[PDB]
Structures are given as structure tokens and as C-alpha cells.
Design an enzyme around this catalytic site. Structure first.
Site, short mmCIF file in Angstrom:
data_model
loop_
_atom_site.label_atom_id
_atom_site.label_comp_id
_atom_site.label_asym_id
_atom_site.label_seq_id
_atom_site.Cartn_x
_atom_site.Cartn_y
_atom_site.Cartn_z
NE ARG A 1 20.86 -9.34 3.78
CZ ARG A 1 22.16 -9.04 3.15
NH1 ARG A 1 22.80 -7.64 3.41
NH2 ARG A 1 22.75 -9.63 2.44
NE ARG B 1 -4.19 -1.91 2.25
CZ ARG B 1 -4.19 -2.90 3.03
NH1 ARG B 1 -3.36 -2.90 4.12
NH2 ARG B 1 -5.22 -3.78 2.78
C1 LIG Z 1 19.83 -18.85 8.20
O1 LIG Z 1 19.50 -18.01 6.80
C2 LIG Z 1 20.59 -18.19 5.94
N1 LIG Z 1 21.46 -19.37 5.86
C3 LIG Z 1 22.20 -19.52 4.86
N2 LIG Z 1 23.00 -20.76 4.93
C4 LIG Z 1 23.82 -21.12 3.88
C5 LIG Z 1 25.43 -21.19 4.22
C6 LIG Z 1 26.31 -21.32 2.90
C7 LIG Z 1 25.68 -19.49 4.75
F1 LIG Z 1 25.56 -21.84 5.15
C8 LIG Z 1 22.68 -21.69 5.87
C9 LIG Z 1 22.07 -22.91 5.63
C10 LIG Z 1 21.91 -23.95 6.74
CL1 LIG Z 1 20.96 -25.40 6.35
C11 LIG Z 1 22.23 -23.72 7.84
F2 LIG Z 1 21.99 -24.64 8.84
C12 LIG Z 1 22.71 -22.37 8.36
C13 LIG Z 1 22.86 -21.37 7.43
F3 LIG Z 1 23.48 -20.45 7.66
C14 LIG Z 1 22.49 -18.69 3.95
N3 LIG Z 1 21.69 -17.61 3.81
C15 LIG Z 1 20.79 -17.53 4.73
C16 LIG Z 1 19.99 -16.19 4.52
O2 LIG Z 1 18.68 -16.01 4.87
C17 LIG Z 1 20.25 -15.34 3.20
C18 LIG Z 1 19.38 -15.15 2.18
C19 LIG Z 1 19.49 -14.03 3.06
C20 LIG Z 1 20.15 -12.83 3.06
O3 LIG Z 1 21.31 -12.84 2.50
O4 LIG Z 1 19.56 -11.71 3.40
C1 LIG Z 2 28.06 -19.11 8.45
C2 LIG Z 2 27.00 -17.83 8.34
C3 LIG Z 2 26.65 -17.24 6.98
C4 LIG Z 2 25.56 -16.03 7.12
C5 LIG Z 2 25.19 -15.80 5.52
C6 LIG Z 2 25.76 -14.71 4.63
C7 LIG Z 2 24.72 -14.13 3.64
C8 LIG Z 2 24.75 -13.07 2.90
C9 LIG Z 2 25.88 -11.89 2.91
C10 LIG Z 2 25.66 -10.94 1.59
C11 LIG Z 2 26.48 -9.74 1.73
C12 LIG Z 2 25.91 -8.60 1.19
C13 LIG Z 2 26.60 -8.52 -0.40
C14 LIG Z 2 27.46 -7.17 -0.72
C15 LIG Z 2 26.72 -6.07 -1.58
C16 LIG Z 2 27.24 -4.72 -1.47
O1 LIG Z 2 28.31 -4.67 -0.53
O2 LIG Z 2 26.92 -3.65 -1.97
#
Ligand SMILES: COc1nc(N(CC(C)(C)F)c2cc(Cl)c(F)cc2F)cnc1C(=O)[C@H]1C[C@@H]1C(=O)O
Ligand SMILES: CCCCCC/C=C\CCCCCCCC(=O)O
Ligand SMILES: CCCCCCCCCCCCO[C@@H]1O[C@H](CO)[C@@H](O[C@H]2O[C@H](CO)[C@@H](O)[C@H](O)[C@H]2O)[C@H](O)[C@H]1O
Ligand SMILES: CCCCCCCCCCCCO[C@@H]1O[C@H](CO)[C@@H](O[C@H]2O[C@H](CO)[C@@H](O)[C@H](O)[C@H]2O)[C@H](O)[C@H]1O
Ligand SMILES: CCCCCCCCCCCCO[C@@H]1O[C@H](CO)[C@@H](O[C@H]2O[C@H](CO)[C@@H](O)[C@H](O)[C@H]2O)[C@H](O)[C@H]1O
Ligand SMILES: COc1nc(N(CC(C)(C)F)c2cc(Cl)c(F)cc2F)cnc1C(=O)[C@H]1C[C@@H]1C(=O)O
Ligand SMILES: COc1nc(N(CC(C)(C)F)c2cc(Cl)c(F)cc2F)cnc1C(=O)[C@H]1C[C@@H]1C(=O)O
Ligand SMILES: CCCCCC/C=C\CCCCCCCC(=O)O
Ligand SMILES: CCCCCC/C=C\CCCCCCCC(=O)O
Ligand SMILES: CCCCCC/C=C\CCCCCCCC(=O)O
Ligand SMILES: CCCCCC/C=C\CCCCCCCC(=O)O
Ligand SMILES: CCCCCC/C=C\CCCCCCCC(=O)O
Ligand SMILES: CCCCCC/C=C\CCCCCCCC(=O)O
Ligand SMILES: CCCCCC/C=C\CCCCCCCC(=O)O
Ligand SMILES: CCCCCC/C=C\CCCCCCCC(=O)O
Ligand SMILES: CCCCCC/C=C\CCCCCCCC(=O)O
Ligand SMILES: CCCCCC/C=C\CCCCCCCC(=O)O
Ligand SMILES: CCCCCC/C=C\CCCCCCCC(=O)O
Ligand SMILES: CCCCCC/C=C\CCCCCCCC(=O)O
Ligand SMILES: CCCCCC/C=C\CCCCCCCC(=O)O
Ligand SMILES: CCCCCC/C=C\CCCCCCCC(=O)O
Ligand SMILES: CCCCCCCCCCCCCCCC(=O)O
Ligand SMILES: CCCCCCCCCCCCCCCC(=O)O
Ligand SMILES: CCCCCCCCCCCCCCCC(=O)O
Ligand SMILES: CCCCCCCCCCCCCCCC(=O)O
Ligand SMILES: CCCCCCCCCCCCCCCC(=O)O
Ligand SMILES: CCCCCCCCCCCCCCCC(=O)O
Ligand SMILES: CCCCCCCCCCCCCCCC(=O)O
Ligand SMILES: CCCCCCCCCCCCCCCC(=O)O
Ligand SMILES: CCCCCCCCCCCCCCCC(=O)O
Lengths: 149, 149, 149
Positions: A104, A31
């Protein structure tokens, strides 16, 4: 029987409610920025709130899967507490992301830490239910009967 | 009780881990193409990797639902093996799609075949737990007591 | 044991099948509007059908989570009936949205009503399994033993 998993069911329900909250926030942004379905593009602020909800939605089934595996095979209270930490970290992720992409990150890493902890508890729980049985069979010379491969 | 479903829980956990892998690949493409959150658009290669992850995410709850129904109502080993075939076909889908949209197709059909097989095992399992009871009631003239409708 | 949840498993499977149907419709729109993967943008009609499928996919894990919590903690038949109302309302949402964004609204509110009803049954079920035990402990002066906090 049922109440052996009632805490996991309660944490699950709370996650569904959190998702409804995120959904309400995107309806409001819709909205506030005149974004009209079927569109998902718009001002950077709307785009952030919308992306936050999409991300929380992608991970909601992963959280549920590990919460239930960890809660059944590890310990119900341990998994349920960890599930709450994950849910609260996601609320903060959402509120952070709505303001800025940088804001975030701290709650995103907190939620990533909490989800990996649940993956670890699930893995430990599964190992606790397989490794001792395999050890017992190996020591008794009955391994082939437990696993021929 | 728990170890009656421990193989399904293990296959579930492996799927969560596969999703974490796909997520790691998109994070890498995000650096390699300077795609900055909150954006999902970019070069065709990034766009392919990102679409592959979205597709795997859409289907991950469907896979879990059928794996658990098939594993509980059909046979645990049959469903778990089929779940592994699906997971490995998705890894190949992802790697294929990253290179080209055409290269994704062979493992996509392999994964579609594996998921339909799990849907079939779930359906068969459910029928095996309802059709015999209905047959017994019909033969005993007690059908109305089992299902009035 | 298994057939205590066989109706919930049947409704789950029917939801997976509905998702396969929505997926088939988007594949058809993809030919009808020459939309080629990896793209999700195109004519407003394709865009509507594609958005309808994305929305149904986001909510499919939420529906499953509440269906299982409601079916286990409230009553299996009540939850299963409610799950069917939700699934049929989503089919109508999809068919409505394909024609127009306004035509999606009546079945969208019907599905929102059905999902909130499932959330309510889950909450009621969970309360029915915790509030009586807490009442019994409070009346017996044994609350601290049930919950120290
Ligand atoms: C808990 O959320 C996330 N977990 C992620 N991973 C994947 C990686 C390779 C980092 F390990 C991941 C996977 C499992 Cl199974 C887990 F147990 C714990 C985790 F950290 C990755 N991305 C997010 C996000 O939400 C990003 C999209 C949002 C953003 O970039 O804003
Ligand atoms: C094991 C912990 C990992 C947590 C997941 C990490 C996820 C996202 C990181 C994205 C970084 C922001 C991108 C750069 C964009 C910019 O600086 O302009
Ligand atoms: C093929 C695999 C080979 C086998 C390898 C085995 C891996 C070894 C890893 C360490 C073993 C587990 O170590 C154990 O971890 C858990 C959780 O962190 C701790 O557990 C404690 O803290 C957690 C916090 O999350 C609580 O939820 C739990 O109720 C409590 O008991 C134990 O105090 C520790 O002893
Ligand atoms: C209202 C519905 C009316 C009822 C209609 C009934 C449908 C009839 C379909 C065929 C019946 C099932 O047929 C049965 O299929 C399964 C799986 O393919 C086979 O099962 C075998 O192979 C599968 C491979 O996936 C293994 O996982 C399983 O452990 C093994 O037993 C059986 O050897 C076959 O006999
Ligand atoms: C900390 C929380 C404090 C406690 C607050 C308690 C909330 C009070 C809310 C009302 C209590 C439940 O009220 C109860 O609702 C259900 C469902 O609507 C009805 O249940 C009936 O209809 C539903 C329709 O969905 C059927 O699926 C169900 O099998 C049938 O029994 C009961 O006839 C009614 O008595
Ligand atoms: C297993 O993945 C997929 N399955 C699909 N269907 C739906 C159809 C109508 C083909 F049957 C399907 C559904 C169920 Cl329930 C099932 F049991 C088996 C399936 F094959 C459809 N699309 C994918 C994809 O991933 C494509 C989006 C990815 C891409 O086009 O790259
Ligand atoms: C059942 O579907 C939906 N539910 C929604 N909410 C969230 C709100 C804040 C309305 F309550 C909701 C959440 C839970 Cl947990 C529930 F139990 C019942 C619900 F209604 C919201 N949006 C949809 C859609 O599908 C819209 C995206 C589709 C479109 O706008 O076309
Ligand atoms: C409790 C029931 C709530 C149901 C969920 C409501 C969801 C979506 C409503 C979007 C309305 C359409 C936006 C306006 C666009 C326009 O008029 O041009
Ligand atoms: C296979 C299980 C992976 C374990 C991941 C452990 C991570 C812990 C972060 C705290
Ligand atoms: C597959 C190996 C499982 C072990 C992972 C658990 C590790 C650390 C928890 C603290
Ligand atoms: C960490 C992941 C661990 C995986 C091993 C668990 C396998 C469970 C097999 C138990 C017996 C059975 O179901 O037949
Ligand atoms: C604490 C670690 C001790 C591990 C003990 C493992 C012992 C022996 C491995 C040999 C197994 C091969 C014998 C096959 C016979 C059978 O098990 O059926
Ligand atoms: C209602 C169940 C649908 C059955 C689909 C069977 C498909 C098998 C592919 C191998
Ligand atoms: C609803 C009908 C269920 C039967 C589907 C199973 C078919 C083939 C498996 C080989
Ligand atoms: C193929 C789909 C088959 C569906 C029929 C299964 C219905 C299970 C009813 C079992 C008894 C019960 O739960 O009351
Ligand atoms: C192998 C297939 C044999 C199927 C047998 C079905 C037999 C009879 C159908 C008539 C049922 C109507 C009688 C109502 C009485 C009752 O069941 O309560
Ligand atoms: C039963 C198996 C079905 C497997 C699912 C099929 C999914 C997707 C096919 C999309 C085809 C590529 C579109 C054409 C684009 C172009 O040629 O330029
Ligand atoms: C915490 C449970 C929320 C209850 C929502 C009730 C909604 C009912 C709509 C009919
Ligand atoms: C957390 C409070 C649970 C009660 C919600 C149920 C309400 C109405 C159902 C009719
Ligand atoms: C409405 C939401 C209600 C939540 C309270 C349910 C808590 C269940 C605790 C039961 C006992 C246990 O698992 O140790
Ligand atoms: C129908 C509503 C009646 C509710 C009854 C609640 C009664 C008393 C609350 C006082 C509890 C504090 C005493 C601590 C001792 C203990 O429970 O272990
Ligand atoms: C979403 C992950 C699947 C749900 C886990 C099923 C519960 C297992 C039952 C243990 C007895
Ligand atoms: C962190 C909390 C401590 C572990 C929780 C133990 C209670 C759950 C009981 C079980 O399932 O074994
Ligand atoms: C919406 C989720 C909020 C839950 C907040 C409680 C988490 C902290 C657990 C210690
Ligand atoms: C994601 C599908 C729902 C999970 C299936 C619940 C397990 C049923 C328990 C059988 C006893
Ligand atoms: C293909 C594997 C063969 C069927 C698996 C049987 C083992 C599971 C036991 C069960 O749940 O009945
Ligand atoms: C990441 C998933 C890999 C699993 C590979 C094993 C599948 C083949 C089963 C026979
Ligand atoms: C998708 C929600 C999780 C599935 C619920 C697990 C079933 C609980 C088993 C009761 C005994
Ligand atoms: C609306 C249907 C009426 C309630 C369904 C009762 C049957 C389910 C049995 C149970 O799990 O208690
Ligand atoms: C594809 C789902 C269709 C189910 C239709 C039956 C719902 C009405 C229940 C009364």
C-alpha cells in the site's frame, strides 16, 4: 459560468464513483469472510480492505476541498489533472493494501505527493488573489483601507 | 467573483492543514505505541488521539458545508471568523483529548457552540433570501406564482 | 446568482441537521449502555446505532458532492427533490438499523437507489454541458481546437 468548473465537477463525480467501487470491494470481502454487520473486525485480509476504504473515505472530503480551491483560484486544468493523479494513486493504494500493508505504501506516498501538490496549488491560487491587491494598496499608501489590522 | 468567496476558501484550506496536523499526531502515536496498520486498537492514550482524529474527520465535511452556506447566504466575514473559532477549538479538543477524555470536554463544547453558530448563520442567511420574496409575493397577491404548494 | 443554488444550500443544511440528530442518538445510546469514550464497542444495539451513524457520516460528503453537481449541471429542483428522498431514506435506515440489522435493508436500498439517481443526474448534467459542444465542433471541423487529444 458552469463550464468554468465542469472539469472539477467531472473529477468530483469520478471520485464518488471510485468510492462506490471501494464500497463494492468491502461488500465482497464481507461475504468471502462471513463478516456480518454490525461488525468491522475479522481476518487480516478483510481488515486491510476495510481499513483502505475507511482511509479513502476520511480523505475524500479533503481531496474535494483542495480540488475546488485549487481549480477556482489557481487553474482548472492543473487542479483537475492533479485530482486524477490522486484518484488513480488511491485505486492503486486500495489494490495494494488488499494484498499487503507494505504494498500500500508506494501508491500511498504517490497519493500523499498528489494531495500536497493540490494543497500547494490552492495556497498559490489564494496568494495570487490576495498578495497583488495588498502590494497595490501598500504602494498607493491605501493599505489601512484594504486591511486596518 | 472569486474573491467574494476567497476568505471561505482560505478558512477551508486552513481546516485541511489542521486535519494534516491531526493525521501527523496519530502517525507519531503509532510509533510510540508500536500500533501497526491495519490496527486501530491499542493503549488508552493512542486510543484517545486516534478517536480525536476520527471525530474531527467526521465533522470536517459538516463544518465545510455550513461555512460555505453561511458565508454565501449570510456574510462572508462573519462565517469565516466563526470557522476560525471552530478550527481553533478543535485543535484544543485534540490536544485536550490526547491528555485525557475529561480535558477534551471544555474545547468540545466551545467547538459545538461555534458549529451551531455557523448552522444558525446558514439558516438566517437562507431565510433572508426566501422569506422577503415570499412576503413580497403574499402582499402583491402573487404567492401561487412563487409557490403553488 | 445565490438563489440559483439556495434550494441546494437548504437541502445541504437539512442534511447537516440530520447528522446532528444521528449524533444525539449515539450520545443517548452511550448513556443507556454506559459506553465511555474513547470506546466504540459495546452491546449489539449500541453497536448497530453507532455503525448507522458511521455509515451516514461516510456517505454524507458523497451525497453533498452529487447534490451540488446534479443541481448545478442538471436541474436544481430535480436534484433537491432527490436529495430529500435520500435524506428521508437515511433517517429510516438509522431507525431501522437501531432495531435490527435486517430492518435497515429496505431503507438502505431506497437510499442507494436515491444516491445512484443523483449520480445519474450529475452524469447527465455533465454530458449535457460537454457532448453538445463536442458535436458542434465535430460538425464544424473544429474538434482539434476544442480537444487536440
Ligand atoms: C493522502 O493520504 C494520506 N495523507 C496523509 N497526510 C498527512 C501527513 C502528515 C502525512 F501529511 C496528508 C494530508 C494532506 Cl492535507 C495532504 F495534502 C497530503 C498528505 F499526505 C496521511 N495519511 C494518508 C493516508 O491515507 C493514511 C491513512 C492511510 C494509511 O496509512 O494507509
Ligand atoms: C509525506 C508522505 C507521507 C505519507 C503518509 C505515511 C503513512 C503511513 C505509514 C505507516 C507505516 C507502517 C507502520 C509500521 C508497522 C510495522 O512495520 O509493523
Ligand atoms: C505569505 C507567503 C509568501 C509568498 C511565498 C510564495 C511561494 C513561492 C513558491 C513558488 C511560486 C510558484 O511557482 C510556480 O509553481 C507552479 C506549480 O508548481 C508552476 O506551474 C506550472 O506547473 C504546474 C504543475 O503542478 C501546472 O499545474 C501549472 O498550470 C503550470 O503553470 C510554475 O511554473 C511555477 O513558477
Ligand atoms: C420559519 C422561520 C421563521 C423566522 C424566525 C427568525 C429567527 C429570529 C432569530 C433572530 C434574528 C437574527 O438576529 C441577528 O443575529 C445575528 C447573529 O447572531 C446578529 O449579527 C451580528 O452578529 C453576528 C455574530 O455571529 C455577526 O457575524 C454578524 O455579521 C453581525 O451582523 C444580529 O445583530 C441579529 O439582529
Ligand atoms: C459517453 C456517454 C454517451 C451518452 C449516453 C447518454 C445516456 C442516455 C440515458 C437517457 C437520457 C436521459 O433521459 C432523461 O432522464 C431524466 C431523468 O431520468 C428524465 O428527466 C425527468 O425526470 C427526472 C426524475 O429524476 C426529473 O428530475 C427531471 O427534471 C425530468 O426532466 C427525462 O425525461 C429523460 O428523457
Ligand atoms: C462539534 O463536534 C460535535 N458536535 C456534535 N453535535 C451534535 C449534538 C447533538 C451535540 F448537537 C453537533 C452537530 C452540529 Cl451540526 C452542530 F452544528 C453542533 C454540534 F455540537 C456532537 N459531537 C461532536 C463531537 O465532536 C463529539 C464526538 C466527539 C467527542 O465526544 O469527543
Ligand atoms: C447509500 O448508501 C450506501 N451506498 C453504497 N453504494 C455502493 C454500492 C457498491 C452498493 F453501489 C453506493 C455508492 C454510491 Cl456513490 C451511490 F451513488 C449509491 C450507492 F448505493 C453502499 N453502501 C451504502 C451503505 O450505507 C452501507 C454501509 C451501510 C450498511 O451496509 O448498512
Ligand atoms: C444497489 C443497492 C445496494 C445497497 C447496498 C447493500 C449493502 C449491504 C448489504 C449487507 C447484507 C447483510 C450481510 C449478511 C449478514 C448475515 O446475514 O448474518
Ligand atoms: C501551505 C501549503 C503547503 C505546501 C506543500 C507543498 C508540497 C509539495 C509536494 C510536491
Ligand atoms: C503558505 C505558502 C504557500 C506556498 C506553497 C507553494 C509551494 C510550492 C509549490 C511548487
Ligand atoms: C496561502 C493562504 C492565503 C491566504 C490569503 C487569502 C485571503 C483572501 C482575501 C481576499 C479578499 C476578501 O475575500 O475580502
Ligand atoms: C516590493 C515590496 C514593496 C513593499 C512596499 C510597502 C511600503 C510601505 C509600508 C508602510 C505602510 C504604512 C503606511 C500606512 C498608510 C496606509 O497604507 O493607509
Ligand atoms: C435551524 C438552526 C438551528 C439554530 C441553532 C442555534 C444555536 C446557537 C448556539 C450559540
Ligand atoms: C429555522 C429557524 C432559523 C433561526 C435560527 C437562528 C437563531 C439564532 C441566532 C442568534
Ligand atoms: C432555514 C431554512 C430555510 C429554507 C428556505 C430557503 C429556500 C430557498 C428558495 C429560494 C428560491 C429558489 O432556489 O428557487
Ligand atoms: C406581515 C405579515 C403579512 C402577511 C400577508 C399575507 C396575506 C395573505 C395570505 C392570503 C394568500 C392567498 C391568496 C392566493 C392568491 C395568490 O397569492 O396568488
Ligand atoms: C450542545 C453541546 C454538546 C457537545 C457534545 C457532547 C459530547 C460528548 C459528551 C460525552 C461525555 C463523556 C461520557 C461519560 C464517560 C464516563 O464518565 O466514564
Ligand atoms: C455514470 C453514472 C451511473 C448511472 C447509475 C444509474 C442508476 C440509477 C438507479 C435508479
Ligand atoms: C456515463 C453515462 C451517463 C448516463 C447515465 C444516466 C442513466 C440513466 C438515468 C435515467
Ligand atoms: C459523465 C461524465 C462526463 C464528463 C465530460 C464533462 C467534461 C466537461 C468539460 C467542459 C469544458 C471545460 O471545463 O473546459
Ligand atoms: C450525429 C453524429 C455525427 C458525428 C460527426 C463527426 C464527424 C467527423 C469526425 C472526423 C474528425 C476529424 C477531422 C479533424 C479536423 C478538426 O475537427 O479540427
Ligand atoms: C468542498 C469545498 C467547497 C466548494 C467550493 C465552492 C465553489 C466556489 C464558487 C466560485 C464562484
Ligand atoms: C497542468 C495543466 C496546465 C494549467 C491549466 C490551465 C487551464 C485552466 C484555466 C484556468 O482556470 O485558468
Ligand atoms: C479511477 C481513477 C482513474 C483515473 C486514471 C487517470 C489518471 C492519470 C492522469 C494523467
Ligand atoms: C460543501 C458545501 C457545498 C459548497 C457550496 C457551493 C458554493 C455556491 C456558489 C455560490 C455562487
Ligand atoms: C462578524 C463579522 C461581521 C460580518 C461580516 C461582513 C463581511 C462579509 C460581506 C458579505 O458577504 O456581505
Ligand atoms: C489551526 C487554527 C488556528 C486559528 C486560530 C485563530 C482563531 C481565533 C479567531 C478570533
Ligand atoms: C461538494 C461539491 C463541490 C461544491 C460545488 C461547487 C459549486 C459550483 C459553483 C457553480 C457556479
Ligand atoms: C423533478 C423536478 C423537475 C426539474 C427541476 C427544474 C427546476 C430547476 C431549474 C434549473 O436549474 O434548470
Ligand atoms: C430529515 C429529512 C426529512 C425530509 C422528508 C421529505 C422527503 C420526501 C420528498 C418528496
Amino acid at each position: 459560468g458552469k463550464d468554468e468548473v465542469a472539469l472539477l465537477a467531472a473529477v468530483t463525480l469520478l471520485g464518488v464513483l471510485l468510492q462506490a467501487y471501494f464500497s463494492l470491494q468491502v461488500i465482497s470481502a464481507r461475504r468471502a469472510f462471513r463478516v456480518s454487520p454490525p461488525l468491522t473486525t475479522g481476518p487480516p485480509e478483510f481488515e486491510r480492505v476495510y481499513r483502505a476504504q475507511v482511509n479513502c473515505s476520511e480523505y475524500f472530503p479533503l481531496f474535494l476541498a483542495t480540488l475546488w480551491v485549487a481549480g477556482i483560484f489557481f487553474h482548472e486544468g492543473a487542479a483537475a489533472l492533479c485530482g486524477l493523479v490522486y484518484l488513480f494513486a488511491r485505486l492503486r493504494y486500495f489494490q495494494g493494501y488488499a494484498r499487503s500493508a507494505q504494498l500500500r505504501l508506494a501508491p500511498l506516498y504517490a497519493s500523499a505527493r498528489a494531495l500536497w501538490l493540490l494543497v500547494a496549488l490552492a495556497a498559490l491560487g489564494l496568494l495570487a488573489h490576495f498578495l497583488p491587491a495588498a502590494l497595490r494598496a501598500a504602494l498607493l499608501g491605501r493599505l489601512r483601507t484594504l486591511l486596518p489590522w
